[PDB]
Amino acid sequence: SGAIYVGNYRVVNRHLATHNDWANLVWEDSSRDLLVSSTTAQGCDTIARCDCQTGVYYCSSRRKHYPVSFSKPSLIFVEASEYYPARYQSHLMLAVGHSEPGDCGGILRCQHGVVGIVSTGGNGLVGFADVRDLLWLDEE
């Protein structure tokens, strides 16, 4: 589990969104595994606006933050799971790192701010849903 709290927005994995998230919906995209809902309180996270390919992510199944090198956001095949059928997920970045189901929502960050959240993984890989192209998260 986990979310990004920027301005009056809460960014979560679409597959882990709550009923309150759907009832306060701003934007969702199944192909990216992302959903954004509105918040009453202002958050403290800032979004990175850069092309970094190195950063640090939080792994809840280890209670640890790990440094990683990650690929550029791309269209990658993600196998059928209990949340989606076999499909291509867009804006996804892969890295070598530990991940389990329950680690989705952990933040990946670089020197400029938050880059994205854990969305996929297995067999010593971890995948992150990029948020750096969502410029509207910085206003209104």
Ligand SMILES: CO[C@@H](C(=O)N1CCC[C@H](C(N)=O)C1)c1ccccc1C
């Ligand atoms: C099968 O679970 C993995 C996964 O890639 N999923 C499940 C959750 C939905 C993911 C998606 N974005 O389509 C696909 C998973 C997730 C995160 C970290 C480690 C794993 C092993």
Ligand SMILES: [Zn+2]
């Ligand atoms: Zn950066």
